[PDB]
Amino acid sequence: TEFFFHTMAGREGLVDTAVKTAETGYMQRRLVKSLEDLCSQYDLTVRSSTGDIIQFIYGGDGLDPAAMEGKDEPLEFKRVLDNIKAVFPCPSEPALSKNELILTTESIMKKSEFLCCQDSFLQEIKKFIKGVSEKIKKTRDKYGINDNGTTEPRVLYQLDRITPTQVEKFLETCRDKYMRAQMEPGSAVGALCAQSIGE
Amino acid sequence: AGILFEDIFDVKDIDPEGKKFDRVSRLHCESESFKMDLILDVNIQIYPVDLGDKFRLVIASTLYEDGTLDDGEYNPTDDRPSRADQFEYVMYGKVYRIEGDETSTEAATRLSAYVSYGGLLMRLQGDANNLHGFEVDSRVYLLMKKLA
Amino acid sequence: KRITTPYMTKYERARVLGTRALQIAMCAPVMVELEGETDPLLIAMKELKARKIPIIIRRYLPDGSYEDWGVDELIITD
Amino acid sequence: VQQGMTPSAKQSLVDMAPKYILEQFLQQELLINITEHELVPEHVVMTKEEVTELLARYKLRENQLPRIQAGDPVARYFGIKRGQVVKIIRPSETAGRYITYRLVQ
Amino acid sequence: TEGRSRDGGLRLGEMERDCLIGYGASMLLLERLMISSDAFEVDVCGQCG
Ligand SMILES: [Zn+2]
């Protein structure tokens, strides 16, 4: 009796797989047909064959879904900062403090090339740098660290090490990763959408 | 001398969570003179360790006690005298994380350093003064010997 | 001045390699010394690595105006 | 109107005079102002110069923009006539904002 | 032709046709579907079209 009931449940899986065949294909065929025409122009707009404007800038950001490291975001800041620290341990440069970090970050961001980048991304970076800067403040405070660098048990300066070379590398890496993560003009933006939803 | 840190410990507990592997144990230790606490893993097939042992360990920058720092290569078949001659169990590893004992809101003067011996973890914790010289990414040797 | 993106889009790379391979298939002069490879696509890839291909892209904006970039001044990437 | 209005006056409500026009709202609709609803992004009307500058920026012909129906509840709210343009500021998933323009037909 | 008793050659069914559009290639699908399937030439009179 158990074997019979077990079979009754099992056959439903086989029946479902048989039924799936046709309907899904029909949906996909209709959908890709409807969307196939669109494309991403060199102006960053997306236009139908007639030349009308569908979106003024693909996706609001212009980014490309197939080039995202974070959860629907182009970057995951703390992971990048961590990577740059390990790749470039700079035992020579002195440890930076809140004021020094904020001053040096502002000076680097002043360069015109970063001004060419998107505003939103710049704001988020500023926020992240503020965040780490306040965190190091707590750490340097609790342990009685001195900003002049003269504290005796020098191991205490390893707690939140960060140095100007590392800051500059991080900012360059951030800018490049953002910049190269855009929807290359001429992509077939429609077909990618129909295929992704259909699957 | 290239010694970074040296002290006598005593073992306190072996497997707080019970047996996990067939060749490794998670020692919990405490230090006699200073009040460091240690977590260490040893290959108990070759260096078996009992629940009551006492031992001295030294963490050193180099095995050439004369002070030579030619760390270009290491040859297992070497025979010239070296600091390894005075110990019974030697490992090689890297210090890969240093952090503060955040549990203390005030009088925060205790640190924790992690040394990873190619899979076999260790953590050494206590007052800041005794931990001078431990640096991230530095490579160090661990030497150990049992005492009666 | 020029407004478009300064990198080379994958589509531009594809069509440049294709048309240069076709040009070298017929007996065109080769602009870089070859060590003995006899496959047009690999010669064209080497030429592009040396950035010597004699091809000028013409990017048509939607309205009808255009912009010209030499294949040596686009930032080629991976 | 409370509940409705007669069909002959429905017909008359389009041809009283070229110089005169009338606009009818339902009591039921007016009970709530859609502008405050959570699912309605802010709409803004702009002067002809603004549309001139916009069409100059993207190099567009006016009939290329996305459309908005005349009978749209918001279009009725603003009482805008055919051929005007409307700016929209969609609240992003984040602090950002996306601007898009729609034409009234 | 179609069969295996007769000679064959497989089908580029419409799903593949979308796949090839998807990547953004253009000569590849032209080649696969016109040069190597039923390439043919005709003539027309421009005056009468
Ligand atoms: Zn004719």
Q: Which residues of chain A are within 8 Å of residue B108 when distances are taken between CB atoms? A: 142-143
Nearest chain D residue (CA) to C64: D59
Nearest chain E residue (CA) to A184: E24
3-state secondary structure of D101: strand
Resolution in A: 3.5
Phi, then psi, of A48 in degrees rounded to 5: -70, 175
In chain B the domains, ranked by start, together with CATH numbers, are: 5-148 (2.40.50.140)
3-state secondary structure of B14: coil
User: Which tokens is A157 given?
Assistant: 């300066």
| Measured distance CA(A87)–CA(B38) in Å, rounded | 29
Residue pair C26/C44 in contact (Cβ under 8 Å)? The answer is: no
Q: Which residues of chain A are within 8 Å of residue C57 when distances are taken between CB atoms? A: none
Inter-residue long-range contacts of B113-122, CB under 8 Å, 24+ positions, other chains counted: B115/B59, B115/B140, B115/B142, B117/B41, B117/B91, B117/B92, B117/B93, B117/B142, B118/B92, B118/B93, B120/B24, B120/B41, B120/B42, B120/B43, B120/B91, B120/B93, B121/B39, B121/B41, B122/B38, B122/B39, B122/B40, B122/B41, B122/B93
Beta-strand relationship, B54-60 and A53-55: unpaired
Please, which residues bridge with residue C67 across strands? C59
The contacts of residue D46 (CB under 8 Å, 6+ apart) are D85, D86, D87
| Measured distance CA(A106)–CA(A100) in Å, rounded | 10
The one-letter code for the residue type at A104 is T
Chains E, B in contact, 3 or more Cβ pairs below 8 Å: no
Q: Which DSSP string do the residues of D24-45 spell out, in sequence order?
A: ---HHHHTS-GGGSTT-PEEEE
Beta-strand relationship, B139-147 and B120-127: unpaired
Q: Rounded to the nearest 10 degrees, how much is the dihedral formed by the CA atoms of B100, B101, B107, B109?
A: -60
Domain range holding C52? Answer: 1-78
Exposure b/e, A50-80, CB count within 10 A at least 16 = b: eeebebbbbebbebbeeeeeeeeebbebeeb
Nearest chain E residue (CA) to A188: E24
Please report the number of interchain residue pairs, chain A to chain B, with beta-carbon separation below 8 angstroms. Answer: 32
Rg (C-alpha) for chain A, rounded Å, is 26
User: Which tokens is E35 given?
Assistant: 């040069």
Please report the number of interchain residue pairs, chain C to chain D, with beta-carbon separation below 8 angstroms. Answer: 3
The length of chain B in residues reads 148
The length of chain A in residues reads 199
Number of H helices and E strands in chain C, helices first, is 2, 2
Please, which residues bridge with residue A100 across strands? none
A186: left (phi over 0), alpha (psi -120 to 50) or beta: left
Chain A interface disruption, residue of E18, E21, E26, E29, most A CBs within 10 A: E18
Selection from B65, B30, B32 nearest residue B143 by Cα: B65
Angle between helices A119-142 and A77-87 (to 10 degrees): 60
Residue pair A197/A31 in contact (Cβ under 8 Å)? The answer is: yes
| Measured distance CA(B8)–CA(D13) in Å, rounded | 101
3-state secondary structure of A161: coil
Q: Which residues of chain C are within 8 Å of residue A182 when distances are taken between CB atoms? A: 5
Which of residues 1 through 49 in chain E touch C, CB cutoff 8 A?
24-25, 27
DSSP secondary structure code for residue A92 in this structure: S
Which of residues 53 through 72 in chain D touch A, CB cutoff 8 A?
58, 60, 64-66
User: Which tokens is B125 given?
Assistant: 């914790």
CA of E44 to the centre of ligand 1 (A): 7
DSSP secondary structure code for residue A78 in this structure: H
Give the max Cα distance, chain E.
48
Count of beta carbons in the 10 Å neighbourhood of residue A160: 19
* Method for this entry: cryo-EM
Element (H, E) at A121: helix A119-142
Put simply, the answer to whether A36 touches E24 (Cβ < 8 Å) is no
Q: B3 vs A193, B60, B87, B145, D24, CA distance in Å?
A: 63, 4, 14, 16, 92
Instruction: Check CB contact of D98 with chain A, cutoff 8 Å.
Output: yes
| Measured distance CA(B133)–CA(A155) in Å, rounded | 7
Chain E interface disruption, residue of C11, C16, C41, most E CBs within 10 A: C11
Q: E41 vs A137, B53, E9, E34, E35, CA distance in Å?
A: 78, 94, 23, 11, 11
Number of domains present in the structure of chain C: 1
B87: left (phi over 0), alpha (psi -120 to 50) or beta: beta
Which of residues 54 through 113 in chain A touch D, CB cutoff 8 A?
54, 56-57, 60
Beta-strand relationship, D97-104 and D85-91: antiparallel
Which of residues 1 through 40 in chain E touch A, CB cutoff 8 A?
14-15, 18-19, 21-24
Residue C54's CATH number? 3.90.940.10
Going across the sheet that includes A53-55, the strands are: A39-40, A46-47, A53-55
